[PDB]
Amino acid sequence: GEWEIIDIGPFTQNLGKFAVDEENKIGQYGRLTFNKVIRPCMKKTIYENEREIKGYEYQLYVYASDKLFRADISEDYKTRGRKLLRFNGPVPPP
């Protein structure tokens, strides 16, 4: 895809919250509460057919219950539906 850094304002904060809510449904790390999203946040755009946008993926660093996790989120272009792809950690700060 094509990659860019985006900042960590309200849009990205709500993506961090979405990731913690989705991970809480999974349960592998017990019950988490969102604390913060830190830099860098990466956005991948995926293209299909003749340079048509198929969707996005956002790579986030997220503090939840004081532990730092790496979360990857997909967003389908047509439906705007979001899905948690992976949530791993604790990871060292970037």
Side-chain angles (χ1 to χ4, degrees), residues 45-63:
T45 304
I46 294 153
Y47 288 91
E48 62 180 330
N49 301 181
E50 128 235 284
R51 299 238 299 288
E52 326 252 336
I53 300 173
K54 182 174 196 146
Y56 311 99
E57 285 182 21
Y58 303 96
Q59 299 191 343
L60 275 68
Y61 281 94
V62 194
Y63 273 112

Side-chain angles (χ1 to χ4, degrees), residues 23-38:
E23 181 54 40
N24 276 341
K25 296 182 188 174
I26 285 174
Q28 232 49 41
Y29 298 100
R31 248 237 45 207
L32 302 173
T33 191
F34 177 78
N35 295 135
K36 187 180 186 184
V37 174
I38 61 167

Side-chain angles (χ1 to χ4, degrees), residues 23 29 68-71 86-91:
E23 181 54 40
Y29 298 100
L68 179 58
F69 296 96
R70 266 280 293 109
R86 55 202 67 77
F87 190 102
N88 282 102
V91 301

Side-chain angles (χ1 to χ4, degrees), residues 70-85:
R70 266 280 293 109
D72 292 335
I73 298 161
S74 51
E75 193 175 82
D76 185 75
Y77 181 88
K78 294 168 194 180
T79 68
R80 306 225 300 128
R82 297 178 165 177
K83 173 179 183 287
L84 179 66
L85 294 184

